[PDB]
Amino acid sequence: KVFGRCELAAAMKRHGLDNYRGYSLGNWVCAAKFESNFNTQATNRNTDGSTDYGILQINSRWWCNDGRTPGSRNLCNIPCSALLSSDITASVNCAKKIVSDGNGMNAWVAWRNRCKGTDVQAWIRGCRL
């Protein structure tokens, strides 16, 4: 599923991400835009052999099991394919664990390079929330 901007904002609110660990909703919408272009099906292979999955590009070395990343830790205890669903619950639940690990949203490269320090509230402007 390719979400619209405001539709995704509403879904992430319904799932408790607004101000989760102090990150306002716009931060999460901005991260999703630049990680996946709001597409739940997005996948991208990395040089180390791991793969990133879904709307928030969650990595198969640490967070989910894809059966082809040797030494994977599977800290979210889920198959990576579950992160590609039109239902974002599994992605949100795993993201909550990632953002709590100590580095906050700096775990998402695109957030640090394209969202951090910008006017992220623009990503929710106009939306009925």
Which residues of the shown chain bind Na ion in the complex (CB under 5 A)? 24-26, 121
| Residue 87 contacts Cl ion per CB under 5 A | yes
Active-site choice (52, 66, 87, 119): 52
Angle at 97 between CA 49 and CA 27, to 5 degrees: 90
Whose Cβ is closer to Na ion: residue 6's or residue 75's?
6
- Give the bridge partners for 124, in sequence order: none
Among residues 56, 58, 78, 88, the one that binds Cl ion under rule CB under 5 A: 88
Helix axis angle, 5-14 to 25-36, nearest 10° = 130
52 is annotated as an active-site residue = yes
| Residue 104 contacts Cl ion per CB under 5 A | yes
3-state SS, one letter per residue, for 11-37: HHHHCCCCCECCECHHHHHHHHHHHHC
Residues making contact with Cl ion (CB under 5 A): 11, 87-88, 104
Catalytic residues: 35, 52
